[model samples]
Target chain A: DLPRPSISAEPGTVIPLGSHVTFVCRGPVGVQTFRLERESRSLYSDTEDVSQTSPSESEARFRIDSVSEGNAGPYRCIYYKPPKWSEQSDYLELLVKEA
Target chain B: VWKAAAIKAATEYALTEGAAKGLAAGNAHGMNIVIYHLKELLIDKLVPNICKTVSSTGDYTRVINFSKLIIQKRGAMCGADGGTLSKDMCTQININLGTVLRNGKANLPDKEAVPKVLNRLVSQADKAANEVAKDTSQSVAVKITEQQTAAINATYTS
Candidate 1:
């Protein structure tokens, strides 16, 4: 069973101006805490998702309050499951262009 | 099977990645050294444009592997003007060693360097892989054999 993790996002087409969207990353149930990193900087603790269910790590649908030119960048979803291995998904680049 | 495949895949990925990192870090000589040794261990398949881009974000050094699928899917990988990068046809390998190997200098922003390093990569990987293929004693070693692994490690730590 390939417990490999994958991800999806809302407003998949593109995030236009003033869009509040969510990213739902999915992994196996055993994966506990989830981390979201943007542009290489580690997201602080206040933003970390501590869910322990189907969406454990990947099922997160965080929002991008308002779309701006700065939001266009490469982001990643990482799943951490201790004592075994940590699986990482591919970097997804979101663009916020002229809506 | 996954272990062996992944390692081989990773190594192939690493070689292509190494091409970029090797040049960026000004390690052409070291690349000449590593790849010259590597060709002795692996095959010289010369998979052109193996990597389109490799960058780091967050905690991962994301290696973006582009596919020929873009060409077929869109009927072209770039603009209808035959995928030319404005002044040229297209740029493949991002790390261009130079038009030719002279004085060890390299071309980073040049449009022609892509094809240059690709040739060097093929030649070096070919030479090294052939050398390794010849030695029955070190069939499993690619870039790191018992003879060179220790020395290589020392260079890194030093």
Candidate 2:
């Protein structure tokens, strides 16, 4: 089975450390988990956090304080079902820099 | 190749202007690698701003090798940090090369598809350039404008 979902970023790109970031995930009819990815050498460099937002109404946010140089690269949000990740919104790069 | 041209461009810019400005390495070796990649890209399609020169060897049955050197290099520059980003970027370019080889090569004689692929590829190269630019991090740059986007979009339409 499959689900349809959408994701978007606030400011569209990197928000400096200590600045706010919102990753919104929504489904046209059902539910999905929104996971965001950053390009780091490792999974540690990149991060994935889970969120729930209605495609039409909700947007989830995560913030970093004192952004590190390593915390930069493209960002992509995905809509997934448990155990099997499927369907993704187009990638939006968030270039985080120290403010 | 983007790498070599940049190395040349940078070294020249460095010597003459007393500054090695711009992002990434600009030189011959860099340009050579970039040329190699561009050659790989053009093998399947027609690309403007890129042309090939065929060479013949002096042997019984001559063999001609057609090549165009561009994107001359692919991240061989170490910044003030003394780090030549070659390792990481080379991996990126390798992966991107696979992409060009797999998907890009699939489009043949599809003139309409060329622009789409070109924009996508140039976009990837821009991101790679941006990756190098961040190493310097002293420069400020601008985003592509809607007008430019519109013009680009205009170039490919029904």
Candidate 3:
């Protein structure tokens, strides 16, 4: 079984339109892949070898450059290692406000 | 087995949805990312599992027919192509998946090489996407700030 990953956004959860938002997913050192899902729809998938980082706080980042109203949603992430896919982390509601 | 199959199918359809809507609005990068996801599904999930199921069950025809059957039986699995921003992503996904199933033994890429190819594309796509984001974010931030400043200037100067 894999450890569930936690997700956080930089510059807070509510972002003004046309601004950028960055999401960071953190988990155990064994995490080999990160997947970002919005409203249960898988939006992005990537593999990262984070074992080398000291203290093993393995994390990967995702960014939405120029966030729009369309981008607003509840997002979650999961980390994977081959046959093991962790349960999705708690949801983070991303609110994009009109600028 | 059912849950694993559902994940594979959901991931595939989501990629197609991103591509269809992204391209219709002129975001080529979105479509490119979708291709990488599709390729990964082939290499990491569908091809291996399908091959294993065929070898173990000795019933290739069953898998192929089951895939086709879903298209007609499942309506939501089909495209949501009926609004202002409409697209028929499901039809294309169905056709391509059917073609791969039809190809079966021949013309499928070498399974051993799949990992290398997929990793390379994933790396390249992420780099490109990140670079574009960097540029876009800076410029957009500058533009928004400028607009706000101008609005204040206009109000005070009048």
Candidate 1's DockQ is: 0.01
Which order, best to worst by lDDT? 3, 1, 2
* Fnat across every predicted model, in order: 0.00, 0.00, 0.00
Model 3 steric clash pairs: none
Q: Give DockQ per model, in order.
A: 0.01, 0.01, 0.01
What tens-digit string does per-residue lDDT give for candidate 3 at B1-158? 23445445544554555444433333235335545455544421333344344334432223333343322222223211111111233223323433112322111112212333334544655566555555554555455545555655565566
Regions of model 3 farther than 4 Å from truth: A49-54, B1-158
lDDT of 3 by residue, A1-99 (tens): 666778999998999989988788888776656655552321232335344344756887777677767778777777665544677799988998897
RMSD (Å) of each candidate, 1 decimal: 21.5, 25.1, 29.8
Best by TM-score: 3
Stretches of candidate 2 exceeding 4 Å from the true structure: A1-5, A11-14, A39-60, A82-84, A97-99, B1-158
Candidate 2 backbone overlaps, count? 37
TM-score of each: 0.33, 0.28, 0.41
Give the DockQ-based CAPRI class for model 2.
incorrect
Angstrom error at residue B120, model 3: 19
lDDT of 2 at A4: 40
Model 2 TM-score (2 dp) = 0.28
